[PDB]
Scaffold this active site. Structure first.
Site, PDB file in Angstrom:
ATOM      1  N   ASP A 162       0.772  -1.150   0.030  1.00 25.99           N
ATOM      2  CA  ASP A 162       0.128  -0.003  -0.027  1.00 25.99           C
ATOM      3  C   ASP A 162       1.060   1.218  -0.114  1.00 25.99           C
ATOM      4  O   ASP A 162       0.640   2.325  -0.627  1.00 25.99           O
ATOM      5  CB  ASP A 162      -1.151   0.098   1.121  1.00 25.99           C
ATOM      6  CG  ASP A 162      -0.282  -0.089   2.644  1.00 25.99           C
ATOM      7  OD1 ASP A 162       0.791  -0.253   2.720  1.00 25.99           O
ATOM      8  OD2 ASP A 162      -1.151   0.067   3.565  1.00 25.99           O
ATOM      9  N   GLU A 163       2.010   1.118   0.680  1.00 29.23           N
ATOM     10  CA  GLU A 163       2.914   2.438   0.492  1.00 29.23           C
ATOM     11  C   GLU A 163       3.801   2.425  -0.753  1.00 29.23           C
ATOM     12  O   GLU A 163       3.616   1.372  -1.475  1.00 29.23           O
ATOM     13  CB  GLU A 163       3.873   2.183   1.923  1.00 29.23           C
ATOM     14  CG  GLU A 163       3.337   1.711   3.165  1.00 29.23           C
ATOM     15  CD  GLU A 163       2.821   2.986   4.158  1.00 29.23           C
ATOM     16  OE1 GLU A 163       2.736   2.707   5.251  1.00 29.23           O
ATOM     17  OE2 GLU A 163       2.602   3.824   3.655  1.00 29.23           O
TER      18      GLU A 163
HETATM   19 MG   LIG Z   1      -0.015   1.753   4.366  1.00 27.99          MG
HETATM   20 MG   LIG Z   2      -1.676   2.243   6.806  1.00 26.70          MG
END
Ligand SMILES: [Mg+2]
Ligand SMILES: [Mg+2]
Ligand SMILES: [Zn+2]
Ligand SMILES: [Zn+2]
Ligand SMILES: [Zn+2]
Ligand SMILES: [Zn+2]
Lengths: 50, 17, 67, 48, 55, 49, 338, 101, 335, 98, 243
Positions: E36-37
């Site tokens: 997600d990052e």
């Molecule tokens: Mg994240």
């Molecule tokens: Mg997060």
């Protein structure tokens, strides 16, 4: 003026209207189906229209 | 169209509830 | 499931256009774009409302338990 | 600061002892009770 | 010796720009962050040899 | 006055959990570093960990 | 599984920093992101070696004839009525268990929900071993609220940071208002160019009446989509001049504006919000229980203890780790430390 | 007599007027921006601006700072009256155009 | 600049008013009527039963946006708020069906109803001045015909499709007289409310009350109320030849024309122009065209959901802005 | 791998350094009152309070701040020696205190 | 933190304090503890309070500071092309505060032909809203993208870009508002200097002012990314191919 407000079972496959007497069976009477569903309640259910 | 309804109809709904 | 009454973004009524869109596609067949434009769906939000709708209620009604 | 839901503020509490300085405030909170947010869930009497 | 000419530089000013005027940094990028990052980049100033990750 | 005030304020205060602070200050950086040794492409030096 | 949200890629309201999304009120009102959860509860009326079995009789009334509040939606058979709402504390399965498994002790299935549900199905059947089986389906409509998670097929997930009125949203010349606003800051570091291409291809597809293709190593060419956009009066790059919804003036930058498929994820804040003041404790350790279902407390572990130590807060250490977790008043002999 | 609608914020108010913050409940950008524009068209006003402190509250703080000629309250009153006159002008023009067509 | 919003290839410029005393040493543009009165103009391009297109010329962005916002979210309208299901055996859940009914717009004139007081008990809150009652009783049966096998479910079943027109107005009390000349019907009768199969039934009634689009979208009376700044295209130097045709193809079809004889391109209709700034990517008209938008010229397009005429919606928005200004002026300022 | 290894070095060093605290006589000691550092860092300075580069005072920023805060165009500038006379009048009490 | 009771179901926090927590509003869940005793409560709010912990103890560099959109909005406001008339400036200041702060409007940078304020004056008023505010800040900082001046002997604020920040008496004289001057890890930061010179309360006041200003400014200004931002120019195609 103002304004106020406003045990049948269903065979799962044959859709017959069952009424289960006191301790008889949990089987449909027309076909042998063993799955019965409660019919919708007869009383009023109110919802927000949102 | 082209006819005023605000003039002839009193706006009740515009009052603050 | 069933066509939404209104466009999510605009609020324009699109629930009265689903059937006319289907009949425009079937009877005297039109392209999807011209069928959407003939129904007044000008903005692309109201266009996608009808273009992307999946009529799942017809499939659900095949399993009607109160026959 | 941290923003806390009113729903979890109505269950998370602080045990404020009644003094001569906050008795009126705590009385208002008791009157409000456990169901409206500026309220209180429990009372522990001094001699109980 | 050293084969640092065979490394990927970049155009970044290291935090130690008040000591040396470095506008370059050998770099490599690794996604040590979650899916997600985004990805994380590592740097090393060529004027002083000071390393730092700009994330 | 400013410099002397800043130097006086910079002194470590008694009671500080300086050991715990140092442990976290050395270990929190130890979480962002890879276990595997990653080197710049082309250094070709001895693979010291 | 998703919806084609009208999306404006722009910084807005400051509630969209860090993946957070800005959702349109009145898009939620019209059914955008509207979902429901259905949950089944299964109870068996088991026969016993003493020729006794559980029963589902009940539905006791008050003197005025109306059922008690615990039995408001219970039906004559003791099983909740289909369509009726069940609030927290109400019984929808009134099961009684024999006390010598003649006399029956109540073991009813009680609804424990922060939000009410609706009984949408009650199934009565038997299993292969000749034993009664009751399944109740509880449904619950869910409005997308603050903290509900969404994603957009490109790894760009986020919670709803704010829900804003439609008139507060930026609008284009035709009055189109985004359903979702996503931060442009999520793009430069993640490099989801496929998401921008999806926006443009979807915009061209909605304007052209054709569903577009984003197939791997292929799909609909970007130049053809730009040709469609230009031929219909839009900018080739999908950037439209919008007006501010709150000032009314033209936004000084052109905004990436178009349809993006957005999936609502199963992580809703309604199932995550937990708060315990006092309650169930594990008898072995006399500490709060472990789960949100059992109303458990949050564990202050070794790392949090170390942080509190590093702060130098001895009294907070004491309060969190003894006073509010397990404070036992023991008797110690001074002579022998027993 | 609505004593809760508009409130002078005494903490954000200067001595002898000429600077004040007014808290207006149940109002948002719609009235805030139009009122701010109209007030800013007052030659005595040197500072007009509103803010909605939080979206969760139906609330609006409007700031007025003037020179010594008038007070912030008088500037606000003049702005409200001028907003009404503007709305009257718009209504009259729209009505005459609708009737004519 | 100077009242013209600048449309560049990468940015928009000059987007603020700059018409107040204190913008410059000439403390001009101070507020007074009889200047706004003579400057302001209204041009109604077209009027329909549901769509109005009109121009508000020489008015400020803040005022025009106030009108737009009030139209969207502050003009009251009547929508179903509570749905009472006597029976619903269809595949659509009760909450979904209630939401759809609420989204159905009703052709009932506001100001013919009174706002519901929320401080009243549910058995005295709904009066005949407050509420419209809509009933809906639809049952599906197999068609007693013999058409081709498995055709469309229109001659195969009876009442297989539930439409908004099946919502029946149920006058209560004096509504039998006041609404006699204007019975309440949905503005869009052919909205597909539900689809259902033989043996399925929907029986409900809905209470329809006044409400605000800011509260719920179902109360919003405009399918979209919006404006756009009037585009401005300035041909700085003559464009002729095949270059004129290329220049003309960068705008919507009827925007700019080609003169016969003089052969130069000219702006034929800038109102038809959507500002795609397609000319600003070609480097051969970079010094030949300037794109702009008149900042104080607003082309309002108001389309009604169906309950009231768009002219009435706009007039109500102006009335609401004036009334809130008036009420605030009359309010005493509390310390 | 980083997620799996989070909370290992910090925990180990924490077990090592839990009980080291600054004493009121400016010594770093164990909980057994044994001296680990007679002065913290050999300096006694908190790393949290260092405005400079591991130094307590940013001389240039401090000088500019003093100049701006005390700026007065109607003030007389000192001679180069008088500046040092003021500096050595302020420093030297403190210098000879040690 | 200090509790603020709100209607929704989430733990909301200012994005400035996301960095110490390492949170990114994408389903992240955080734990909230209510200390039950007076001594524990006082210890918590006096030793672990956000205002008392703007600096990381590992290096002393600030860790609570501007995040992405706050930095971008500050940069766009302080961009050298930003000029504001009196009405826009006063609206910006009202959004910067809660419409409850007195602002001493300075003379405009441009007095002819129009009274125009620069965005650097806006941020100067952010630092020091009026004469009663004691925050007088003096600062020299290099922005992260600093191209040097045209000449070696020329001073640092003469950079070809707005790469060098000069603050003298809380007045921003040069340089854009950057990550390096409003973000983490820099001891020449505006908020770091405000902290070290005037207290955590003043630093927090400035940070809250900036956060409110950016949250209200970016949406009305417009900042977007599109495919055209990542579309290479035509000449780059040929140059890259041949290279
Ligand atoms: Mg994240
Ligand atoms: Mg997060
Ligand atoms: Zn059967
Ligand atoms: Zn639409
Ligand atoms: Zn260097
Ligand atoms: Zn003993």
């Amino acid at each position: 003026x103002x304004x106020x407000x406003x045990l049948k079972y269903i065979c799962a496959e044959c859709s017959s209207k069952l009424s289960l007497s006191r301790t008889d069976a949990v089987r449909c009477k027309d076909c042998g189906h063993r799955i019965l569903l409660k019919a919708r309640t007869k009383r009023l259910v109110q919802f927000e229209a949102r | 169209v082209s006819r005023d309804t605000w003039n002839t109809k009193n706006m009740r709904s515009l009052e603050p509830p | 499931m069933i066509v939404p009454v209104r466009c999510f973004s605009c609020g324009k009524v699109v629930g009265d256009k689903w059937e006319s869109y289907l009949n425009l596609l079937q009877e005297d067949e039109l392209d999807e774009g011209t069928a959407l434009s003939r129904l007044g769906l000008k903005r692309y939000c109201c266009r996608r409302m009808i273009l992307t709708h999946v009529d799942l209620i017809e499939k659900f009604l095949r399993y009607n338990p109160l026959e | 600061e941290v923003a806390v839901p009113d729903r979890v503020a109505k269950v998370l509490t602080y045990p404020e002892k009644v003094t001569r300085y906050n008795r009126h405030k705590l009385q208002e909170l008791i009157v409000n009770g456990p169901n409206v947010h500026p309220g209180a869930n429990y009372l522990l009497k001094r001699n109980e | 010796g050293g084969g640092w000419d065979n490394v990927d530089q970049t155009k970044t000013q290291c935090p130690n720009y008040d000591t040396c005027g470095g506008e370059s940094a050998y770099f490599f990028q690794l996604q040590i962050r979650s899916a997600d990052e985004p990805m994380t980049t590592f740097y090393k100033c060529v004027n002083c040899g000071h390393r730092w990750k700009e994330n | 006055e400013i410099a002397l005030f800043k130097y006086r304020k910079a002194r470590l205060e008694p009671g500080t959990a300086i050991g715990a602070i140092g442990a976290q200050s050395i270990g929190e950086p130890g979480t962002q570093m890879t276990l595997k040794t990653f080197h710049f492409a082309g250094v070709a030096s001895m693979n010291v960990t | 599984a998703g919806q084609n949200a009208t999306v404006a890629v722009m910084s807005y309201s400051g509630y969209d920093i860090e993946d957070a999304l800005v959702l349109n009120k009145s898009s939620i009102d019209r059914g955008f992101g509207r979902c429901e959860t259905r949950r089944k509860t299964t109870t068996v009326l088991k026969r016993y070696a003493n020729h006794t079995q559980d029963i589902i009789g009940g539905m006791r009334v008050d003197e005025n004839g109306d059922p008690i509040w615990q039995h408001q939606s219970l039906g004559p058979d003791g099983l909740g009525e289909v369509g009726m709402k069940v609030q927290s504390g109400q019984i929808y399965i009134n099961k009684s268990v024999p006390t010598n498994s003649t006399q029956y002790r109540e073991a009813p299935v009680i609804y424990r929900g922060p939000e009410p549900s609706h009984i949408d199905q009650v199934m009565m059947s038997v299993s292969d071993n000749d034993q009664a089986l009751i399944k109740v389906l509880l449904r619950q409509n869910r409005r997308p609220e603050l903290g509900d998670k969404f994603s957009s097929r490109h790894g760009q997930k986020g919670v709803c940071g704010i829900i804003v009125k439609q008139e507060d949203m930026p609008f284009n010349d035709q009055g189109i208002v985004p359903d979702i606003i996503m931060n442009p800051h999520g793009f430069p570091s993640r490099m989801t160019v496929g998401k921008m291409i999806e926006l443009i291809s979807g915009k061209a597809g909605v304007l052209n009446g054709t569903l577009e293709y984003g197939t791997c190593f292929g799909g609909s060419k970007l130049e053809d989509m730009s040709k469609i956009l230009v031929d219909q009066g839009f900018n080739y790059s999908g950037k439209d001049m919008l007006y501010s919804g709150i000032t009314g003036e033209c936004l000084q930058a052109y905004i990436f504006f178009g349809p993006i498929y957005y999936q609502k994820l199963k992580h809703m804040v309604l199932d995550k919000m937990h708060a315990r003041a006092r309650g169930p404790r594990a008898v072995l350790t006399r500490q709060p229980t472990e789960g949100r279902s059992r109303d458990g407390g949050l564990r202050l572990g070794e790392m949090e203890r170390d942080c509190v130590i590093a702060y130098g807060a001895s009294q907070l250490l004491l309060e969190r780790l003894m006073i509010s977790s397990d404070a036992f008043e023991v008797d110690v002999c001074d002579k022998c430390g027993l | 007599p609505d004593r809760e609608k508009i409130k002078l914020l005494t903490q954000a108010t200067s001595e002898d007027g000429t600077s004040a913050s007014f808290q207006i409940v149940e109002e948002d950008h719609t009235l805030g921006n139009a009122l701010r524009y109209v007030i800013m068209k007052n030659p005595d006003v040197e500072f007009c601006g509103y803010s909605i402190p939080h979206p969760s509250e139906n609330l609006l703080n409007i700031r007025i700072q003037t020179y010594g000629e008038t007070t912030a309250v008088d500037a606000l009153q003049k702005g409200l009256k001028d907003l009404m006159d503007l709305c009257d002008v718009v209504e009259s023009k729209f009505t005459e155009k609708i009737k004519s067509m | 600049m100077s009242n013209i919003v600048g449309i560049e290839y990468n940015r928009v410029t000059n987007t603020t008013s700059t018409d107040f005393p204190g913008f410059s040493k000439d403390a001009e543009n101070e507020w007074n009527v009889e200047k706004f009165k003579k400057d302001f103009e209204v041009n109604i391009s077209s009027l329909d039963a549901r769509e109005a297109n009109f121009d508000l010329i020489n008015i400020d962005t803040s005022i025009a946006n106030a009108f737009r916002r009030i139209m969207i979210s502050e003009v009251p309208s009547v929508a179903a708020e509570y749905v009472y299901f006597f029976n619903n055996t269809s595949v659509i859940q009760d909450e979904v069906l209630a939401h759809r009914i609420g989204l159905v717009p009703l052709k009932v004139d506001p100001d013919m109803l009174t706002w519901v007081d929320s401080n009243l008990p549910d058995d005295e809150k709904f009066t005949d001045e407050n509420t419209i009652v809509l009933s809906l009783n639809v049952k599906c049966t197999r068609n007693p015909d013999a058409p081709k096998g498995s055709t469309d479910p229109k001659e195969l079943y009876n009442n297989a499709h539930v439409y908004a027109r099946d919502l029946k107005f149920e006058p209560q009390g004096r509504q039998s007289t006041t609404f006699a000349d204007c019975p309440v019907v949905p503005a869009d009768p052919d909205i597909l409310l539900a689809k259902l199969r033989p043996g399925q039934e929907i029986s409900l009634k809905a209470h329809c009350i006044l409400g605000i689009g800011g509260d719920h979208a179902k109360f919003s009376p405009v399918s979209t109320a919006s404006y756009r700044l009037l585009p401005q295209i300035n041909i700085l130097q003559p464009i002729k030849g095949e270059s004129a045709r290329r220049f003309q193809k960068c705008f919507p079809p009827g925007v700019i024309g080609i003169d016969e004889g003089s052969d130069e391109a000219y702006v034929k209709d800038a109102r038809k122009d959507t500002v795609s700034r397609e000319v600003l990517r070609y480097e051969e008209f970079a010094d030949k065209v300037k794109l702009g938008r008149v900042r104080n010229h607003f082309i309002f397009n108001v389309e009604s959901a169906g309950a009231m005429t768009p002219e009435e919606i706009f007039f109500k928005s102006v009335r609401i802005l004036k009334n809130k200004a008036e009420y605030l002026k009359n309010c005493p300022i509390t310390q | 791998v980083k997620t799996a290894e989070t909370g290992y070095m910090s925990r180990r060093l924490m077990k090592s350094l839990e009980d080291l605290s600054c004493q009121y006589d400016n010594t770093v000691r164990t909980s057994a009152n044994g001296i680990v550092q007679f002065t913290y860092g050999g300096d006694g300075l908190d790393p949290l309070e260092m405005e400079g580069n591991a130094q307590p005072v940013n001389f240039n920023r401090s000088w500019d701040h003093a100049y701006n805060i005390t700026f007065n165009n109607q003030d007389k500038g000192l001679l180069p020696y008088a500046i040092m006379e003021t500096a050595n009048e302020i420093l030297g009490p403190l210098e000879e205190r040690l | 933190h200090y509790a603020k009771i709100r209607p929704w179901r989430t733990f909301r926090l200012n994005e400035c304090v996301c960095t110490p927590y390492n949170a990114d509003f994408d389903g992240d869940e955080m734990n909230l503890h209510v200390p039950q005793t007076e001594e524990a409560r006082a210890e918590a709010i006096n030793l672990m309070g956000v205002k008392n912990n703007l600096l990381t103890p590992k290096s002393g560099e600030p860790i609570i500071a501007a995040t992405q959109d706050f930095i971008t909005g500050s940069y766009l406001i302080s961009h050298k092309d930003s000029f504001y008339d009196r009405a826009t400036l006063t609206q910006l200041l009202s959004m910067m505060s809660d419409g409850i702060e007195h602002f001493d409007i300075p003379p405009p940078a441009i007095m002819k032909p129009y009274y125009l304020w620069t965005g650097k004056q806006v941020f100067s008023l952010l630092i020091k809203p009026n004469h009663n505010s004691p925050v007088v800040i003096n600062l020299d900082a290099k922005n992260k993208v600093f191209v040097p001046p045209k000449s070696k002997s020329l001073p640092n604020e003469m950079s070809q870009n707005d790469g060098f920040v000069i603050i003298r008496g809380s007045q921003i004289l040069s340089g854009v508002m950057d990550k390096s001057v409003l973000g983490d890890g820099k001891k020449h930061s505006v908020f770091y200097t405000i902290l070290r010179d005037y207290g955590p309360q003043e630093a927090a006041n400035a940070m809250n002012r900036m956060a409110k200003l950016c949250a209200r400014f970016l949406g009305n200004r417009g900042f977007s990314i599109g495919i055209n931002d990542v579309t290479p120019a035509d000449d780059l195609k040929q140059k890259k191919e041949e290279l």
